[PDB]
Structure 1
């Protein structure tokens, strides 16, 4: 269990463009979440909490200033809206709503945007304006298998937001389907552990990771405990966190602990250049694990 004392530096005043605001918003949001879940608030000063909620809220508001008339986000208003960033924002808010109330029109508009504008007939989500801060997108930064990876990223957001936006966005169940579709077809062909992981969780949430697919996923793990590639410690942490989440979704608790172990054993506590995805995923994953710890 990553110790609250070693995390102080994740409560961060969120400043900047539609990206840096999210960069600074990410760690705070996920940290409060961790402490909430792992109960560690008394250890680390109850009164610091109200403090960070306002901080989060601040992030949230500030972000809204970058929302376009389409209900999608780019770094600034002048810029072409970003498929990834929009997806990322939804992802974060969906988690944030556990802590702060949100405006569901903001979020549901964002989703309806991704669906009707950026999903292909075949079911992939297409990126038209790559995010300036390429480092924040985690493992998607790698070119290879990009359709599949970006499609997984969006899906994971749309599922994470599914339960809020279902009545408002009438195309949403269709989209989830059409994406998961696509992921099934190309899943057997994946090369990167990274992609196997993200897409895995994407399809795990969908009860679609089974038979030879579940097999591909599990056997991709190096040492039955981590999803790695010659890239970076961070990709791998990210990749693994997804994988952990995926395992939780299948409920193969019999295979989980050596994974958690590894994640725990990384001496990594969020924060830094490129850290956004690795931070958000690893504490999301780990907390889910606590909730579900039998």
Structure 2
């Protein structure tokens, strides 16, 4: 969906996968379940942490479905209904999060719809430590990724008053991507 302006992306292939995730790997409540975990468990990024995988995965798949919205609205009619469902589950279980990574990846999935207000909006902001990074006690690559999703969320909600401090923290890290298991860390840090 991001490389649609770079090369010739087929609508049949792109929408074909979108239609599958909705009618197959989606619970009635809107939760997406993993049935066949990828072999390379280092390319998934912060999703490797077993903690709250019912929120991280659902938030990850949700983002991909919204970025392929305009491309797959006429070819997929079950998209609008699925988008709302996935947002309902994350919204209800958003106040029950501890990991800064989960809060960030879920915040951007709700910010795209504009469903990140009230207490939910306050939590996402207060989660950031020193108000410039969404970090968790562990690897740094997961923190860089979490901050990336958080940045995109702020940009989607148009909060340019809390962006400068965040972006500054990223550039000072001097992370030029690349490195074992840096698929998510690189793709997201440069997308933000």
Short-chain TM bin? over 0.9
- DSSP 3-state at the match of 1:271: coil
Instruction: Tell me how far apart the structure 2 counterparts of residues 165 and 263 of structure 1 sit (CA, whole Å).
Output: 33
Which string of whole-angstrom CA distances, capped at 9 and with x for unpartnered residues, describes residues 248-282 of structure 1?
00001001001000011111001011100000000
1:191 shift after superposition: 1.0
Which string of whole-angstrom CA distances, capped at 9 and with x for unpartnered residues, describes residues 165-194 of structure 1?
011111001001000010001000011000
Higher RCO (CA-CA < 8 Å; seq separation 6+): 2
The alignment's TM-score, normalised by the length of structure 2, stands at: 0.98
Give the alignment partner of residue 29 of structure 2, picking from 122, 126, 130.
122
Instruction: Tell me how far apart the structure 1 counterparts of residues 89 and 74 of structure 2 sit (CA, whole Å).
Output: 24
Instruction: Tell me how far apart the structure 2 counterparts of residues 216 and 114 of structure 1 sit (CA, whole Å).
Output: 29
Instruction: Tell me how far apart the structure 2 counterparts of residues 211 and 262 of structure 1 sit (CA, whole Å).
Output: 27
1:98 shift after superposition: 2.3
Query: Structure 1 runs of 4+ off > 6 angstroms?
Result: none
- DSSP 3-state at the match of 2:129: coil
1:246 shift after superposition: 0.1
Aligned length: 190
1:132 shift after superposition: 0.3
Which string of whole-angstrom CA distances, capped at 9 and with x for unpartnered residues, describes residues 90-118 of structure 1?
xxxx0111211210110101000000000
Give unpaired runs (5+ residues) of structure 2: none
Bigger radius of gyration, 1 or 2?
1
Which string of whole-angstrom CA distances, capped at 9 and with x for unpartnered residues, describes residues 63-100 of structure 1?
xxxxxxxxxxxxxxxxxxxxxxxxxxxxxxx0111211
- DSSP 3-state at the match of 1:118: coil
Instruction: Tell me how far apart the structure 2 counterparts of residues 227 and 256 of structure 1 sit (CA, whole Å).
Output: 13
- In structure 2, what is the equivalent of residue 280 of structure 1? 187
The alignment's TM-score, normalised by the length of structure 1, stands at: 0.64
* RMSD, matched Cα: 0.6
